[PDB]
Design an enzyme around this catalytic site. Structure first.
Site, PDB file in Angstrom:
ATOM      1  N   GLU A   1      -5.432  -3.545  -6.894  1.00 28.94           N
ATOM      2  CA  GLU A   1      -5.733  -4.178  -5.613  1.00 28.94           C
ATOM      3  C   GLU A   1      -6.694  -5.344  -5.832  1.00 28.94           C
ATOM      4  OE1 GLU A   1      -4.334  -3.649  -2.880  1.00 28.94           O
ATOM      5  OE2 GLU A   1      -3.556  -1.591  -2.898  1.00 28.94           O
TER       6      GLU A   1
ATOM      7  N   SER B   1       0.797  -1.216   0.000  1.00 28.95           N
ATOM      8  CA  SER B   1       0.000   0.000   0.000  1.00 28.95           C
ATOM      9  C   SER B   1       0.833   1.271   0.000  1.00 28.95           C
ATOM     10  CB  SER B   1      -1.000   0.044   1.161  1.00 28.95           C
ATOM     11  OG  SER B   1      -2.183  -0.661   0.858  1.00 28.95           O
TER      12      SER B   1
END
Length: 262
Positions: free
Chosen positions: A141, A45
């Site tokens: 993602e 992330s």
């Protein structure tokens, strides 16, 4: 050859069982301290910073872009959507998506940013435009977090990410309003209390973005304003040999504590 700083980081790495990457930039004198500074690590992330910055760059020429509403459909949700789930069949603006991606690590929000940029390659193209020759975003993602040892997908090096984070937050890779906005977002992060911040004096102001993924990958990138002296940029990346290794945010805190000495 190593300094005592690097020796302490190597001992931390050895005790941890994993692989640690550190890059510090001291903007007082532009010196760098690196540990495995030119090895690639899975960003997880932490890549959300580059995506949010790329949209900020777009907004320099489209002044209302951050306030543009983006539809959130039920089908857009992935594995961790703490903010986006509140907006299914509604909207989030690009600013709201950036804040959710950066400050809560919402993965749906990141996918919306990536889509805004034309796909992962649009994030990489922005990196190249600001002089980052190392960053690559390959996937969306959640698969960008697979973090397989040896796999260059969705990786960067500590040195490159520290240089880029400096350029984005303290330099002028972004326009003035945009740099300030990125700083505001990073400073308000909610996920960082156990990572770099836990290893630094409480009087220091910190903006950061954490990351986590498979192979116990545990990351944090930060811009730091110590008391009474010029700011610093610190990247701490950590990954482990086995796919289901546990998170080790304490290792990042320990690395920051070592780096802060002196």
């Amino acid at each position: 050859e190593t300094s005592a700083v690097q020796q302490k980081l190597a001992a931390l790495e050895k005790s941890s069982g994993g692989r640690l990457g550190v890059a510090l930039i001291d903007t007082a004198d532009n010196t760098q301290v690196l540990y495995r500074g030119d090895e690639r690590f899975p960003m997880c992330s932490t890549s959300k910073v580059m995506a949010a910055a790329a949209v900020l760059k777009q907004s320099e020429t489209q002044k209302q872009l951050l306030n543009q509403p983006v539809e959130i459909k039920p089908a857009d949700l992935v594995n961790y959507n703490p903010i986006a789930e509140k907006h299914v069949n509604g909207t989030m603006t690009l600013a709201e998506l950036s804040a959710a991606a950066l400050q809560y690590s919402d993965n749906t929000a990141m996918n919306k940013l990536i889509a805004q940029l034309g796909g992962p390659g649009g994030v990489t193209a922005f990196a190249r435009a600001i002089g980052d020759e190392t960053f690559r975003l390959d996937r969306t993602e959640p698969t960008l977090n697979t973090a397989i040892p040896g796999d260059p997908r969705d990786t960067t090096t500590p040195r490159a990410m520290a240089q880029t984070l400096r350029q984005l937050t303290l330099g002028h890779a972004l326009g003035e309003t945009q740099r300030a906005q990125l700083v505001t977002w990073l400073k308000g992060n909610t996920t960082g209390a156990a990572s770099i911040r836990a290893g630094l004096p409480t009087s220091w102001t910190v903006g950061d973005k954490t990351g986590s993924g498979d192979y116990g990958t545990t990351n944090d990138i930060a811009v730091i304003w110590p008391q009474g002296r010029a700011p610093l940029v610190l990247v701490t990346y950590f990954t482990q040999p086995q796919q289901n290794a546990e998170s080790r945010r304490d290792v990042l805190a320990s690395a920051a504590r070592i780096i802060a000495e002196g």
